[PDB]
Amino acid sequence: HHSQELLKDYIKRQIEYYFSVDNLERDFFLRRKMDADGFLPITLIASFHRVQALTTDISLIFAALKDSKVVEIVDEKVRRREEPEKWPLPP
Numbered sequence: 001h002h003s004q005e006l007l008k009d010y011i012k013r014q015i016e017y018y019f020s021v022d023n024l025e026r027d028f029f030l031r032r033k034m035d036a037d038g039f040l041p042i043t044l045i046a047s048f049h050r051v052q053a054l055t056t057d058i059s060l061i062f063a064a065l066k067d068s069k070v071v072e073i074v075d076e077k078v079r080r081r082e083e084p085e086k087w088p089l090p091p
Contacts, residue, residue, distance in 0.1 A: 007054060011064035014050050019071050019080040024087050031089040038084025039077035 017023055018030060034040055045051060046061055055061065065073055072081045080087065 008064040011054050016070040031087050032091050034088035038079035042076050042078050
């Protein structure tokens with residue numbers, strides 16, 4: 001539906017904010033959960049308050065992120081496309 005495309009757009013922009021440089025410079029929790037290549041489980045992102053308010057439908061979260069030039073998906077993990085390896089921190 002148009003409703004579902006609109007919701008996908010809000011989800012997309014919310015998660016793109018988490019992976020923005022502006023957020024990453026202060027988001028020590030997110031960086032501590034990255035693996036050494038920058039990847040995080042998409043299901044971890046799904047638990048964040050502003051995403052979980054919008055949806056609990058994991059297919060909708062994946063579909064929103066397929067549409068993104070900010071992030072890259074491999075299987076069930078997601079990372080910032082640009083220089084992701086610079087951001088991980090010790091757990």
